[PDB]
Design a protein around this ligand. Structure first.
Ligand code: JGP
Ligand code: JGP
Lengths: 304, 304
């Protein structure tokens, strides 16, 4: 029993992290097969970042201008290309520790583990969610760019995120591994404001199921609701609208606990309207939204 | 910027996890050099657990009764001994992935990463604290026994915890790697109640510094206090007493932020007395106590 914010074991990804230096900028790269993936802003000075023309900056760069170091050994760069906002540096050596992997573009609400790295060396691992405004709330200092987000299905690492920047509000923006930003963000030092950081309703419900399963049941009430009635309250409290697709996804947790999804929605509705009154759920004083239904099932069943 | 509950990268420990089976009980072992460490209750049936005589149960066990599997390969057990509440199974093969390591017995308040494992396979990694009542609040299903807690200093893994049991209240108890329980707990299925789970005051203060550093400053007040005045409030709110040793440990965070430790104590005192009034600090509605001063400095400076 118990329920923890839990990251995937990071070993498979640790094996992929390298240091990329271009001139005086050092950040992290991901080494998969004979390709190192890194943020294209590695070619920028702090000056360049104000209005970079990446294609023009890249003309001034050759293979030998990108220094790739894996541990204390240098990799030979035999090719480089820019795909959207990432650089792909072809090296002469396949990463011998390349795990089974996929590049996936996740949806808002989806959770993933981040291996925070500095100079190509892992510092820590944490769990986070793609926010509905396509930011993430990370822990990233200077040098952490190119740190990656991932899920694991048994032995296959799905890479979903590469860290590129911090907004003036101290939230995080980055790309998938094809170099496409999540949301409307760009790798430029400009006014970029995030939209409304709404609560991931389906994730809250999942976590309320996790709570019931782990014996925290005080918030279960005597009411039910409908998707339309619930959504009116959701809207008011900056919760994401709940769809039938979310209800379907919650089916197994409904089945396990014998609490109909709309009943749990009615318990959530009362929690929003009445607050937690100084109570906690799974040791939280607010409604946790960075566990997916899949995360709850995984942790409650003990998938490895 | 940003501040996350962050575990150590788990790869070094992933390399140490094995499956231990004795008869019909399967749990996890830690394989370091040519020794596999596991909970001695691996020799117990669910029946035995009510009043096990471990020395008597062990007489009925030979080297060949302990099945040790690392991936899909069996290890040959050439010796076994019981040290306190752990078994040490000598195998004929040194773990080739043995990291630099130490066994350390941590104090209450100290944080560590847990690699949750099932059948010797890692499921996830999370951060937790040795509670002042020598429990931890983990996420452990059946088969997770022998999962370990650890800190990393650069390349040296300090093993501090091995998971042994869940109390009837769903909190966790385990040993150091010499098999000595944290607190008064025993590997027997009996009435074992935890004492008061007090708040780790020094850790709250550290996390308030982390908050100020990351721009969350609304709770900073116009007051200071003394250790004796603060402690009277601490006592009342089931916070651990703050010592000069804790004040000294907070010195670097005091220095960095320019907020005297006793001033932050006075801000904490007001938060206890006045509550958070629906406000959050670092996205928490309660005062987080599972970051040490060392953790805050590490994450705020970006140690790898
Ligand atoms: O809802 C509660 C409440 C009840 C029990 C609790 C709790 C809160 O937190 C821990 O256990 N209150 C508090 C007392 C006044 C009545 C209305 C609001
Ligand atoms: O202390 C607060 C408060 C103020 C601002 C906040 C907040 C809480 O949470 C988000 O921003 N209140 C709420 C209003 C009535 C006055 C006393 C209690």
């Amino acid at each position: 029993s118990g329920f923890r914010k839990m990251a995937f074991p990071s070993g498979k990804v640790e094996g992929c992290m390298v240091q990329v230096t271009c001139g005086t900028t050092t950040l992290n790269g991901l080494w998969l097969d004979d390709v190192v993936y890194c943020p294209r802003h590695v070619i920028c000075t702090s000056e360049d970042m104000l209005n970079p023309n990446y294609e023009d900056l890249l003309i001034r760069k050759s293979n030998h201008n990108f220094l790739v170091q894996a541990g204390n050994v240098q990799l030979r760069v035999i090719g480089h290309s820019m795909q959207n906002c990432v650089l792909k540096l072809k090296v002469d050596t396949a990463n011998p520790k390349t795990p089974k992997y996929k590049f996936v573009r996740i949806q808002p609400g989806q959770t993933f583990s981040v291996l925070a790295c500095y100079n190509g060396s892992p510092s820590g691992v944490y769990q986070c969610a793609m926010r509905p405004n396509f930011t993430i709330k990370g822990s990233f200092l200077n040098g952490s760019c190119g740190s990656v987000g991932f899920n694991i299905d048994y032995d296959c690492v799905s890479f979903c995120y590469m860290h590129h920047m911090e907004l003036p509000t101290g939230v995080h923006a980055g790309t998938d591994l094809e170099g496409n930003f999540y949301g409307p963000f760009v790798d430029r030092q400009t006014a970029q404001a995030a939209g409304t950081d709404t609560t991931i309703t389906v994730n809250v419900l999942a976590w309320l199921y996790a709570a019931v399963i782990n014996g925290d049941r005080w918030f279960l009430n005597r009411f039910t609701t409908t998707l339309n009635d619930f959504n009116l309250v959701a809207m008011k409290y900056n919760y994401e609208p709940l769809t039938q697709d979310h209800v379907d996804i919650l089916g197994p947790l409904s089945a396990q606990t014998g609490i109909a999804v709309l009943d749990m929605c009615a318990s959530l509705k009362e929690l929003l309207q009445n607050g937690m009154n100084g109570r906690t759920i799974l040791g939280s004083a607010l409604l946790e939204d960075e566990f997916t239904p899949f995360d709850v099932v995984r942790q409650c069943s003990g998938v490895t």
